[PDB]
Structures are given as structure tokens and as C-alpha cells.
Design a protein around this nucleic acid. Structure first.
Lengths: 328, 122, 111, 111, 110, 111
RNA sequence: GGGGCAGGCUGGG
RNA sequence: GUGCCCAUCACCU
RNA sequence: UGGCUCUGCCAACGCUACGGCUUGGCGGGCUUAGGUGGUCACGGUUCUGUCCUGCUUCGGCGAACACGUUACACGGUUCGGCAAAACGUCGAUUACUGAAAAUGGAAAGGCGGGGCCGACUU
């Protein structure tokens, strides 16, 4: 939007934006110590935050680092509501000036693209193109390997406002190799970072059938030797340019199924991943033999959304036959 | 920056009040819809609805279980007011649905008050 | 000091909020009367606090300031007619915060 | 004993219609009668969250005050009074609540 | 006993309530406060009788004393007069009667 | 007591005319001021019977609140109701009842 | 032999 | 703790 | 918001310090977002059944019953045509301006499809 973006700290600290950031930061978190300690003097707090950001004295408070194992052993560093609000106020001005240069086929943490628009893009781009083959790649430890230095050569070919840049550099220092997972700022900058490989797939390499979801990159082909080339070129790039090691990759015939984004995406069907089933199966079974068959309806309604995309009719019949509960 | 601190920060009082603000935000509109007549009942309902926040707040800052039970008595009085505004108020005041909705919100605040009473009682 | 200072700083809250609290339409009259009793009645909370030094009295002064902040939130919500505009809440919260600072220092002094 | 409240809520259901009826003329009496009638629920509720006989006696005092209000509103003059029937046919309702309160007081007193 | 005081105080109310409704709108706060002191002292007596702390029998005395204040205050409140010096004399007699009963009751408890 | 109230009657007799001059606009502040002014008599009276110093400090808080009300009516009320002179004369009368309250506080906390 | 599912038993919780 | 979806809950256009 | 410490008028519960006040009618004035859940980006050991043990481009992907791993049928996940524009992106925080790009600042062009235009369906 002008290829210069050279006055964003004026828009980041607009009261009208910090109120959006505030409502975005509090959305869902209105039962937390952070919201409720902030809510007290909310607009006086946003007036001392606006005026911290406007001054260039905003300093990001220390990450409260816990860790959960239920999804996967992570290393989740939280931020204070003040800090998640500053991040929300950045990523209301700064996000749409990055998320607009993200090629259409990056499906992570950008509005109107999702897990579900991505799996659909892959299935779709699998049906059209009649892909005989596909390269699926994945970045080792993506966030904990993002350069935070060649990231700020992309967060700086676009921000050009030398105060947004210094707010971006408070909210995420320009030195190290570790974009924190559990930052709104970081979802964005990882999509941006990876977006570099998108513009080594789509720009260089002239790959027109792909999808990237944050660190996972599907690349439908037709010649499996070309897709192995593409991968080699993608890995060499993302290693030399971005410091990303490719954990897993494969160049499978579209027949193995593209284990993309929680689904297994053939042209014709889209089985979800067995993990999801087993987790859900077990979750349901537990709910039954826990007397919690009323929160199960809420869980079921949820998983009925994660699976309305997938070809889970058979599975939904099967789960209705095993426990009776109204899946769909 | 460090958000403007109140003293005696009680997570439970802050949480209960934010959840009770939803009771107010629901009931205050339908407390203000109560006609001119039934204005004393309304004023008394509004003083029970909007004045329960003070009961929670004083319970939070003056960490004394008495003020928490006074908060419980007020929530029970607010539950009465739902009963009253539904049944005894004649034009209508509160549609049966609205009592069902409000009772859910007050129940949420009831849960939090109960947990808070319990955590203090230990 | 202490009680005298807190009240003079709280007089600024009243000086700001009493005009706002007198503008609340008779419609929101119970809210207004309760807001005015919370605003003008927090002086009594401070006054009692500096006549005892019972730190519980300065905590119930904090509860009153917290109730006053509720009232700001609430009166900014009240959609019928309307009252404390989000700005008026912002300005008032700054004043109450200055009173909050003084109350906090006073609580700590007593501690 | 929470049949008290649900037996008192028929006192309210009887007395509230004729308490709203009390004209603006007798407005202070009405507001105080309505606060006695609708506010006796709080008296019962506080009694039932404690089972302290003090709160049970306060509930009794409120029922006795409500009986006063009936006799007062009887002689309030004009086509604005509580008709002698209503005074009697509410004292019956309050008496039922009075019986339960008495039993409840006794239950607590002889633990 | 609460029954006796209240029946004698009902005479105070029956005299003063008409007078306390005649207190001008100008002196409306004083009137509504006087009415809440007048009707409302019944609750003070009733609470004193349906319990026993003596403190409640003193709060009844304080209310009667506050009612006596209100009489003297309303007598010569302003140019919108409220209670004539006479109405005060009549009311003070009735309040004195309930004062005597309250005193005897305080004594019988003490 | 008796003498404190007789000296506070002078405060009321001075301030009540001032409180009745407050325009309709500031009617709720007036009602609240009048309930602070005319309602401090009850605070003195209840201390007079129930001699507990707790009731005596509430009388002091009420006098201090009445002094706030003078501050408030002189300035914070936008048409500064009480003229600065009237605050001076009122504070003299409140000071006289303050002296008596102080002596009474001292007489009670003799040991 | 390895492997997954559902139950054994023990921790976490 | 972060985002993406799903469900349900209020509430008027 | 059953207001008004508010007036004019008329009455009468009444109260009057005899002025009024009270009270009643009667006019006028003042009066989509959020909440809550729940998907997607705890194990350890032997045992008893139960099935798999296939694939590989050597990265890994599976399997073990969602069992036709699939509602075997498509989601506007449609089909064409374009790609001018706008968008994106590189050109570029470049040329240019100006001492300095300094919170100015292009473009030609190149690359996209994200866009466009129909068809058919939604």
C-alpha cells in the first residue's frame, strides 16, 4: 500500500486502534488476571500505553513461560495483557501490510484463509492440475529457528516507519534465532518469514500449485523428479537464506495422501488424521465413562466442525453407532 | 507501563464483577423496561442489580468472608428479583426466557462466588 | 497529608464526575443516584480511613474507588439515553488512578 | 427452611399489586412498604445463609413491620387505602410466613 | 412490649403523617426524610421487640429523638413552613407518650 | 447527645437554607447534601444513646463529610452554590460541633 | 520379532 | 499463552 | 424510568404561622460485538484380546478399522476466457526531489492471481 508504509506508529497508537487492540487482546481472555487487572483502569491504561508507544518508551514485559504437553510438549511463553495488547496494536497496522504481500497460497494466521481454506486449496489444486505427485515439506523447529535478523530484513522492506520498526524490535528483538511461539506478533512474522519460501516457490521456481500453512508446504506436481528438484531448491534456500532445516519431506504420488493441516487430502476425499480420530474417539469414550455426556455435546459440536470438511460421514455414522450421540 | 494497579487485588472479585457486569448488562436493560408503574420495584431491583457490584467489590478488597456471604445474599436477592420480575410483576417485566437467560448469568456469578467463598473458607 | 491529600486528589474525581453524574438522564436515575452516592460517598470512605488508620478502612476506600471504576464502565455501557462517554471514562479513570496511586501509597505507609 | 421464601413470595404476590397501587400522595409510605415487602426476601435469604437466630429475629421483625404496614396502609385515607379485606387477606399470608418463621426460630433455639 | 409502643406510636404516625405529607415540596427532602423517620420508627420499635439487644431498644430511642429533632427542625424550617409550633406541641405529646413507654421498656430490660 | 445536637441545629439552620438554594439542576447533590446535613443529627443522636466510641467516630466522619459538602457545594457544584463566605460561617458552626464532638470523643476514651 | 487399536496395572493428574 | 475454525449462548437490525 | 425543591388553573384527604402548603385532577415548561466451550497448528510398563507389518523417490510415509481408510460425491475446493486495470510482488525504502530522504517519493518494466469477465451452479 504505497510500498513504503512510512508512518505506522501514528496508526498503531491511534486511540481508535489501541481500543481495537484492547478489544482483540481481551477477546476470550475476559476471565484472566491480565484482563481483569487491566480492565480496572482500562482506558487510563491504554492512555499510558498509547503514550508509551507514541514516545518510544514501550518496553515489552518479560515472557511468562510455561509449557503444555496436551497438544505437544511446547514452550509457551505468555505475555502480559499490556504486551499482548501492544502486539495486537502492532498486528492491526503491521499485519495487513505483510499479510497482503503473502502469496494467495499461504494459509496460516491470515484472515479469510485458514486450516480449512488451506486443505481445500490443496484438495482443489489436487483436483484441478490432476497432480500425479506432490512434495510435502515441513520446517524442523520453525519458530525456534526463524532468523530474527533475516526476519527483520522482511519486517523492514515493508515497515519503513522507523518507530514501528523500533516497536517491532521491542516486541521481537532483532537478534537471535527464535521467534517466540505464543505471540501474535510471532504468528505473523513466521508467516512472513516462511513467505520467503513462498516467493521462492511461486516467484523463483515458478511453482503454481502449492500451499503453505506456516511451516508446512505442499507442492503438487506431475513430475516427481521436478518436485524433488523444487524441494532441494526450497531446502537450500530456506537453509542458506532463512536458517530453516527441513525436518520431514516427501515426494509422494497423490495416492499417499497429503498429510496437510490435520487432513489427509486426496483429490477425491479428505480423511482427517488418525491422531485426530483417536484423540476424539478417546475423548468421547472418556466423556461417556466420566458422566460428562453434556460437555461431550459441546466437544462433539466442535469436532463436528473440524470434521465437516473431512470425509467423516462413515466415521460420524460409526461414532453414532458406538455411543449414540448426535454427531452431526 | 505496568497497568494502573488497584490495591487489594482479588482475582475472584475482579472475575466475579466482570461476570456480574454481564448480569447487569442483561438485566439492567430489562430492569429499565419495567414500566413507570412498578418504578419502586424497578428502583429496588436496580439497586439490587447495580448494587451487587459494590457487594462483590467490598468483598474483594475487604478480604472478610462476611462480605462474601453478604455478596451471596445479594445474588440470592437478585435471584428473587428475577422470580419477582417474572411472576409478580403484572404487565410482564421479564419474559420467561429472560429469567432463564438471567438465571444462567447469575448462576455463573454464583459459581464464581461459591468458588471464592470456598477458597477463602480454607 | 494522607487523608487531606487523598481527598483533594479525589475532589478532582468528583469535580470531573459530578458533572457527568448529574447529566445521567432521569431514565438512568437509579444508576445516577447510586453513582452519585458512590462518587460523593467515597469521600466518607477516605474520611473514615484517615480517622482510624485501620488498613481495612483504606481497603474499603479502594473498594469504593473500584466501585467508582465499575460505575464508569457501567455508565459507559448503559445504552438507553447514555452517559460517561468512553472518553469521559478515560479522563475519569486517570483521575481515579491518581487517587488510586495515593490510596496505594497510603495503604503501603500503614502496612 | 426455604419454604419461607416461597410462602412469603405469595405475600409479595398479594401485597405488591396493592403496594404499587399506593398513590404518589402516599409515596414515601409506599416506597417504605415496598422496601419492607420486597426487602423481606433479603431478610429471609440472609437468615437462611446463616441460620443465626439474630437474622431469624430480623426476619420476624420484618414480618411484624409488614403487619404494621398493613395496619398503617388501612388507615391511609382517601380512595387510596388498603381495603379492610386486603389487610385481613394479607395478614393471613403473612401469618403463614409468620408460623414458618416461628417454627424456624424454635428449630434453631432448641437446636 | 413492642405491641404497646407500636400502637401508641401509630398515634404519632397518625398525627404526623398527615402533617409530614403537608410539608411543602420545597422542603421535600426534609419531608421524605421526616416521613422515613416517622414511618420507619415503627421498624425500630418492632426490631427492638422481636429481638433483644437493648442496642435495638436504644436505636428506637435514637429514632424517637430524631423524630423530636425533625419536629423542632420542621417548626421554623423556612418561609414554606412545615410544622406549626402547635403541630409540634401536639406531636411532642404523642412522641412523649411513646417516649415514656420506651423509657419504661429500657428500664424493664435494664 | 443534647448540646452537640443543639449546636449542630445551628449548622442545619445555616446550611439548610443554603441547601434549598441549590438549583433543581443539582437536585440529587442537594438531596444527598440534605441527607448528610439533616442526617448527621441522627449520627449525633445515636451516639448519644449507644455511647460506644464507634458511633462517635461515625458522627465525626459525618461532620467531616459535611465539611466536604461545603467544599463540594463551594466550587465542584458548577454554579458554586455555597459562596466562600457561607463556607467560612458554616465551618465555624461545624467547628463548634466539632469541638464538642472532640471533647466527647476524649471523655469516652478516658481509658 | 516389530506395529496399532481396546481393555490389565501403576505413575502423572 | 498464540492463532485458525466449529458449536452453543445472549442481543437488536 | 410511578419525576420536578414547577408553574398557571380548578377542586378537596387534609394541614395551616390564614399567607399558604399538601394532595388530586387540569394545561404549559423541564425532564455487529461479546460470552462460553471444543477441534487443528500426559504417560510408563507387562498382560489379554484384536488387527497391520505395507510402502519408499530412502527424506520418510503409512497400517492396525472412519473400512469402499472416503456420503466414491462434491463443496463455488466449478469450468472456460483474460490478466488491461486494481491488488500483490520484485524493480525500490531505487530513479527523482532535496545538503541530506530527512517518518518524501515514483514509474517503465518483469513476475503472480489474489484479480477480472462470462458460463453453469451456488
Amino acid at each position: 500500500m504505497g510500498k513504503r508504509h512510512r508512518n505506522l506508529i501514528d496508526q498503531i497508537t491511534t486511540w481508535e486502534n489501541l481500543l481495537d487492540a484492547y478489544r482483540k487482546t481481551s477477546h476470550g481472555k475476559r476471565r484472566t488476571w491480565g484482563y481483569l487487572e487491566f480492565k480496572e483502569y482500562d482506558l487510563a491504561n491504554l492512555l499510558a500505553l498509547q503514550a508509551e508507544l507514541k514516545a518510544g518508551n514501550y518496553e515489552r514485559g518479560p515472557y511468562r513461560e510455561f509449557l503444555v504437553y496436551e497438544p505437544k510438549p511446547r514452550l509457551i511463553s505468555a505475555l502480559e495483557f499490556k504486551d499482548r495488547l501492544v502486539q495486537h496494536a502492532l498486528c492491526n497496522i503491521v499485519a495487513p501490510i505483510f499479510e497482503a504481500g503473502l502469496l494467495p497460497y499461504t494459509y496460516a494466521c491470515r484472515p479469510d484463509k485458514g486450516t480449512h481454506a488451506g486443505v481445500c486449496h490443496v484438495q482443489a489444486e489436487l483436483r484441478r492440475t490432476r497432480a500425479t505427485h506432490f512434495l510435502k515439506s515441513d520446517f524442523s523447529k520453525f519458530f525456534p529457528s526463524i532468523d530474527r535478523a533475516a526476519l527483520y530484513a522482511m519486517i523492514d522492506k515493508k515497515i519503513h516507519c522507523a518507530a514501528t520498526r523500533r516497536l517491532l524490535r521491542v516486541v521481537l528483538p532483532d537478534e537471535g534465532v527464535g521467534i517466540p511461539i505464543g505471540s501474535l506478533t510471532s504468528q505473523l512474522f513466521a508467516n512472513v518469514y516462511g513467505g520467503a519460501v513462498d516467493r521462492l516457490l511461486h516467484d523463483e521456481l515458478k511453482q503454481r500449485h502449492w500451499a503453505r500453512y506456516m511451516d508446512d508446504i505442499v507442492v503438487l506436481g506431475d513430475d516427481p523428479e521436478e518436485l524433488r528438484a523444487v524441494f532441494y531448491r526450497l531446502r537450500d534456500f530456506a537453509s542458506e537464506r532463512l536458517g530453516l532445516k527441513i525436518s520431514h519431506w516427501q515426494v509422494a504420488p497423490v495416492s499417499r495422501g497429503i498429510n496437510f493441516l490435520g487432513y489427509r487430502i486426496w483429490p477425491t476425499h479428505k480423511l482427517l488424521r488418525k491422531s485426530s480420530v483417536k484423540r476424539a474417539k478417546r475423548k468421547v469414550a472418556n466423556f461417556i465413562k466420566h458422566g460428562e455426556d453434556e460437555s461431550l455435546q459441546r466437544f462433539l459440536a466442535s469436532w463436528s466442525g473440524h470434521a465437516q470438511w473431512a470425509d467423516t460421514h462413515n466415521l460420524f455414522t460409526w461414532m453414532e453407532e458406538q455411543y449414540g450421540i448426535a454427531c452431526h | 507501563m505496568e497497568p494502573i494497579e488497584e490495591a487489594t487485588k482479588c482475582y475472584d472479585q475482579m472475575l466475579i464483577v466482570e461476570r456480574y457486569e454481564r448480569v447487569i448488562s442483561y438485566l439492567y436493560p430489562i430492569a429499565q423496561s419495567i414500566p413507570r408503574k412498578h418504578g419502586v420495584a424497578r428502583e429496588m431491583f436496580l439497586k439490587c442489580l447495580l448494587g451487587q457490584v459494590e457487594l462483590f467489590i467490598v468483598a474483594g478488597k475487604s478480604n472478610q468472608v462476611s462480605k462474601l456471604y453478604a455478596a451471596d445474599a445479594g445474588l440470592a436477592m437478585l435471584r428473587f428479583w428475577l422470580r419477582f420480575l417474572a411472576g409478580i410483576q403484572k404487565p410482564h417485566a421479564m419474559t420467561p426466557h429472560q429469567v432463564e437467560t438471567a438465571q444462567v448469568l447469575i448462576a455463573e456469578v454464583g459459581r464464581i462466588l461459591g468458588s471464592w467463598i470456598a477458597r477463602v473458607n480454607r
